[PDB]
Amino acid sequence: VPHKSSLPEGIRPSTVLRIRGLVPPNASRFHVNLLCGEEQGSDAALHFNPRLDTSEVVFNSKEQGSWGREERGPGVPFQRGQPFEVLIIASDDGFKAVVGDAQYHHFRHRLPLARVRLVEVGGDVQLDSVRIF
Amino acid sequence: PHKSSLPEGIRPSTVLRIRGLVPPNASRFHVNLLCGEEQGSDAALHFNPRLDTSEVVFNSKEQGSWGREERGPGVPFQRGQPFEVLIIASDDGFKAVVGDAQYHHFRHRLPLARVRLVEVGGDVQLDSVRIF
Ligand SMILES: OC[C@H]1O[C@@H](O[C@H]2[C@H](O)[C@@H](O)[C@@H](O)O[C@@H]2CO)[C@H](O)[C@@H](O)[C@H]1O
Ligand SMILES: OC[C@H]1O[C@@H](O[C@H]2[C@H](O)[C@@H](O)[C@@H](O)O[C@@H]2CO)[C@H](O)[C@@H](O)[C@H]1O
């Protein structure tokens, strides 16, 4: 079952989102979104989208209904049927995505961090824990 | 132990991840954020789980003198058992996470830019020390 939780005060630099779970053996894609929260179909400071089906991990933002320029991570550090741990570390300059034991990609901010009011984790993924530190 | 230099220091949003095991005969181990490799160097953070006295002590040290100790709530470590600690450097302090829970927040005494070395030692067997 997905995760959706409010960050009504916003997230500050040095906020750490730790997500642990398992990629199902038949997974296509899942996502981690940091959103405006006002509703859904609204602005995304971070859309982190591992796609097992097309063998890519896409990063993007969305403002006023329009996607920005996609960034892609190096390789796919996820595997169908295998557990994973992701850290998303909010800094002053961007989001550091850590998967497993290594920094995976650094996504510089497009929206101010103060615009993040909701965390959503969904799609083809089984969640063990979503913690905000 | 683990002892590694930080060329450019640590910046806010640095995450230090430590995985290992407390040996069955442990007394104490520590995680230090120090200004340098020399003896008695200043410590921005001294994080000291003490199995022998059933406490977790945090402190700083400047010009040879320890500051006022802080103690964490309970001892989330046990002899013979593995552990995972996160130390998260922010602009306001060091957040210590043990297992699945925020454990203690240690507000900065020394400037963060003075941290140039990370040391993990004492009665601990390490699986991983990673800086993110
Ligand atoms: O940018 C992330 C979004 O991508 C959308 O599809 C992209 C696709 O990744 C790209 O190859 C090309 O076809 O442009 C499409 C539209 O931007 C997804 O539909 C959406 O879910 C996001 O993942
Ligand atoms: O503040 C950390 C240092 O504690 C020293 O031991 C203290 C002890 O915590 C206190 O209860 C009292 O007995 O004074 C002792 C000496 O200052 C340790 O010796 C030192 O290694 C640090 O951990």
Neighbours of B29 (CB within 10 A): 24
- Give the atom of ligand 2 at the shortest distance from the alpha carbon of B59: 1
Please say whether the beta carbons of A7 and A120 come within 8 A: no
Distance B117 CA to ligand 2 centre (A): 21
Q: How far is A91 from chain B (nearest CA, A)?
A: 5
Q: Rounded distance, CA B119 to CA B60, Å?
A: 14
Q: Which of B13, B18, B86, B98 to mutate to test the interface with A (most CBs of A within 10 A)?
A: B13
Q: What residues does each domain of chain A span?
A: 1-133
Q: Rounded distance, CA B17 to CA B72, Å?
A: 18
Q: Rounded distance, CA B60 to CA A116, Å?
A: 34
DSSP symbols for A22-75: E--TT--BEEEEEE--SSSSS-EEEEEEEETTTTEEEEEEEETTEE---EE-SS
Q: Rounded distance, CA B95 to CA B117, Å?
A: 18
The gap from C-alpha B64 to its chain's centroid, in whole angstroms, comes to 18
What does the DSSP 8-state code read for residue A9? T
Q: Rounded distance, CA B100 to CA B86, Å?
A: 10
Q: Chain B residue closest to A133 (CA)? A: B102
- Mapped onto helix, strand or coil, the DSSP state of residue A131 is strand
Q: Rounded distance, CA B67 to CA B131, Å?
A: 26
Distance B66 CA to ligand 2 centre (A): 8
Own/partner contacts of B50-57, CB < 8 Å, gap of 24 or more, are: B50/B75, B51/B22, B51/B26, B51/B27, B51/B75, B51/B77, B51/B78, B51/B79, B51/B123, B52/B27, B52/B28, B53/B28, B56/B103, B56/B104
Is A91 in contact with B13 (Cβ distance < 8 A)? yes
Q: At residue B75, what are phi and psi to the nearest 5 degrees?
A: -120, 95
Q: Which residues lie across from B96 on neighbouring strands?
A: B87, B104
Please say whether the beta carbons of A50 and A105 come within 8 A: no
Taking alpha carbons only, the member of A112, A18, A110, A27 closest to residue A71 is A110
Q: Resolution limit in angstroms? A: 1.9
Q: Rounded distance, CA B78 to CA B23, Å?
A: 9
Q: Chain A residue closest to B127 (CA)? A: A101
Please say whether the beta carbons of A80 and A25 come within 8 A: yes
